[PDB]
Structure formats: C-alpha cells, structure tokens
Design a protein around this ligand. Structure first.
Ligand SMILES: [Ca+2]
Ligand SMILES: [Ca+2]
Length: 279
C-alpha cells in the first residue's frame, strides 16, 4: 500500500533516504495488535480513528482529553491519515491532567494497570504501550516501566526534550524499555532531543502533523512525537510476525537506517526507525 503526500515522518520511516513524500506500508497495517497510549487521554470520537480508539482508564474526573497531547500521539500511532499502524486498536489511559502534568504515583499506577488490563483484551498479534512523558530520575518510575515490559508489552518511551543525557530522566533511563530520540526532516537530531547511551532508536519528532482535540489537526514537536512512530512501527511489525513484544526494540534497531543522522554525540546510536517495506 502507498499513502501519497504523507506527513514527512511516515514517509521517512518507509524510506532509506530523507525528502520523500510517500508512505509505503503493508496493507495489514497493524490489524490484530493493540497499542495503549498512556497520556492525557484520547479524543476517541475523532473521525480519524474510525471507531478503533477507546478510553479504558482515567485517574482524573473525566476520561476526556482536554489537552490534545494524547490525541496527537494516538494519531501518530494509528489514525487513518497520520498514523503508522492504520488498523491497530488504540486504548487510552489518562495519567496526565489537562495541563499535561501528572504525579509519578499516578503514572506508575497507569503502567501497572496496562500490565493487567491487557489480559482482558483480544490482541492476538500483541500489545504495545507508548509513553510520551517523563521527568527527573526515579527508580520507582523506572521499575514500573520494567515491570510493564516484563509482563509482555512492548514499551516505548520518550527520551525527553532537554538536549541532555537521558540517563537523568525517567522512564527514559530504564534500559529494558525502548527509549526514543527525535530527528527532523533533514535527518538532524532534533535540537531539543535528549541523547546518550541509553537511547535505543530515533524517530521523526520535529514538525509532526497529527490529530488534535475538537476534531482538528496540528503540527507540534518533541520526543513525545517520535515515540508513537516507534510504538506504531512495533505494532506493525508484530502483526507481520517479524518480531515479538520482548524483542521488538532490538529488531527495530537491527533493521534501522544506520548512520543517516547528523549532530549525534559520540556514544549515542545513529539509528533511525525504518519499516523495510518492499512491494
Ligand atoms: Ca540512508
Ligand atoms: Ca533500551
């Protein structure tokens, strides 16, 4: 399948070079997989989700996304026009309030919730969790991410936007999950992207067009935007049978575009998510 005039990020993950505008992907498109978006919520009624999204848990007064961040990330995972895995099932867990903030205790509870909840869902091709959030180092937050990964969920987390070593941020610094940095359309490390040895992979993160609340769209930037590219790619590859939840991050790194990125500090991987599609 081919989506013409795709958002640059989708085109980038199906090409060995920057500057293309078509997203090439297998028609299976993540069908039979499930992705939990742990964030500010998801506007599930947005036409772009085609009924494939639903809220399953909130830690606040409402399950509504009053911010937009979660809806944007969800859109990059699996919306029709802006998504990597266009037929995946999306589950929203609202651990962030409508200002985009959340206590570590709530974020941890949300991770433990997903580890349990997945046992009540029909996700024959596997389960992914996308965490476009983070803050200062916390061994408790790292431990929760490790548990979620251990339980059989492919965990993808944002490296953070501090232009610093991700070792001082959580859950970015948990080695057992998939830690994602951001690149721009010219294959540069995004100027805000964290780096360091704990990074596993880079994905598109600057000027990413996706769904927004009020049935709208908008373009924003961050490692929060790169993370759902990788989460969606994992769901896509699991549906194809190429990899499993335990090994998807490694498979993605193994099959990535290597050495294409500029402004990568010594000691950080130069690996850009790539779906290796061939018609
Ligand atoms: Ca290349
Ligand atoms: Ca890792």
């Amino acid at each position: 399948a081919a989506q013409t005039n795709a958002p640059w990020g989708l085109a980038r993950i199906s090409s060995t070079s920057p500057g293309t505008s078509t997203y090439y992907y297998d028609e299976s498109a993540g069908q039979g997989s499930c992705v939990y978006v742990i964030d500010t919520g998801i506007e599930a009624s947005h036409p772009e989700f085609e009924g494939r999204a639903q809220m399953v848990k909130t830690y606040y007064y409402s399950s509504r996304d009053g911010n937009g961040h979660g809806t944007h990330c969800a859109g990059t995972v699996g919306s029709r026009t802006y998504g990597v895995a266009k037929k995946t099932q999306l589950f929203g867990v609202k651990v962030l309030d409508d200002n985009g903030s959340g206590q570590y205790s709530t974020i941890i509870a949300g991770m433990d919730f997903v580890a349990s909840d997945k046992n009540n869902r029909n996700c024959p091709k596997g389960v992914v969790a996308s965490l476009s959030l983070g803050g200062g180092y916390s061994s408790s937050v790292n431990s929760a991410a490790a548990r979620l990964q251990s339980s059989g969920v492919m965990v993808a987390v944002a490296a953070g936007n501090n232009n610093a070593d991700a070792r001082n941020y959580s859950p970015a610094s948990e080695p057992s999950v998939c830690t994602v940095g951001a690149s721009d359309r010219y294959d540069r490390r995004s100027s805000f992207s964290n780096y360091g040895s704990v990074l596993d992979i880079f994905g598109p993160g600057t000027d990413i067009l996706s769904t927004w609340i009020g049935g709208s769209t908008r373009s924003i930037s961050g490692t929060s935007m790169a993370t759902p590219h990788v989460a969606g790619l994992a769901a896509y590859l699991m549906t194809l049978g190429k990899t499993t939840a335990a090994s998807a991050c490694r498979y993605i790194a193994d099959t990535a575009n290597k050495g294409d990125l500029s402004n990568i500090p010594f000691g950080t991987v130069n690996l850009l998510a790539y779906n290796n599609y061939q018609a």
